[PDB]
């Protein structure tokens, strides 16, 4: 069976880390408040965190659903999902990491080759990703997605933005083997700097990530049904500067063909854009999108509602600023959009302030 999605898409991207409370009665009230908040927002879709992320340290150690391989911090994904689907009027996408799982140490990790060093290493300021070139990684991540699919009912999958590789990655042994078997000549350095192979190499890696996600969605669809929608977060640079695929292994046209929804992280401050230049940056982004026929109809522009800091103390973005950006998108012909993150505990962003620009059901 199939499942239609009413135009336009308006998305809340929601973490469960602060919904969780070790006091069961408090967690009950938290969930009730969250369900009511999404209901009142009157939008179309929630991208719902299925994994725990208490530290923001780029590695999933625990999840919100029972499963074979990782600790379950609390059984709350299915509980929140079915109530959002029936009380709050939204489709639910299970938001899952693709690679950043704290599994068996013998499983291959993604590594990069540091300039001037012989041995590959793990990049300190990147997601702690397992290698998609390790068959056992593919198997075990497959088991996690199947465990999710078997325990919970939902409408789609959002594949995490951790499915990325730089131009010095993946330097792990299984990755080297894969390149060699795919006909690439020499070391990673020689490939990376080979005029006749470096672009083909970037595309090989982009496709390997994409094919891996499609393996996962097939496994979920086998259990839940064919109606399950797919979405994947894409970084903005591969959209506005496609040569940057070389150090993201993400390709916008590929996403548009492969997934139901391409969730662009339309986040200027994340990309280092000055406050006074953010609107123009977003305008340029929408221009690039509109220049690709039908791209906007399969893309979601995900705005940021926090300004993340290296030292961990993230700075909020005002509801006014967020509503302003939503209006900017609308006025530039983009109707599918959303934001991350949400904070029910402080009504941030403020329901009453963003609904006019966010909810299609809103009236004066
Ligand atoms: N523009 C640079 C690339 O030139 C470089 O190769 C890459 C390395 O990861 O990072 C980018 O910021
Ligand atoms: N912090 C990420 C990096 O992955 C990347 O270096 C940067 C440049 O595009 O975009 C950000 O979202
Ligand atoms: N910089 C972090 C990353 O986890 C991610 O790339 C992005 C998601 O929206 O923003 C923050 O959460």
From Swiss-Prot:
One of its GO terms (biological process) is carbohydrate metabolic process. Its EC number is 3.5.1.-. Keywords: Cell outer membrane, Hydrolase, Lipoprotein, Membrane, Palmitate, Signal. It is found in: Cell outer membrane. GO terms for molecular function: hydrolase activity; hydrolase activity, acting on carbon-nitrogen (but not peptide) bonds; hydrolase activity, hydrolyzing O-glycosyl compounds. Disulfide bonds: none annotated. Contains a N-terminal polysaccharide deacetylase domain, and a C-terminal domain required for PGA N-deacetylation that may be involved in binding to unmodified poly-beta-1,6-GlcNAc and thereby assists catalysis by the deacetylase domain. Belongs to the polysaccharide deacetylase family. This is Poly-beta-1,6-N-acetyl-D-glucosamine N-deacetylase. It comes from Escherichia coli (strain K12). The chain holds residues 310 to 669 of 672 of the full protein.
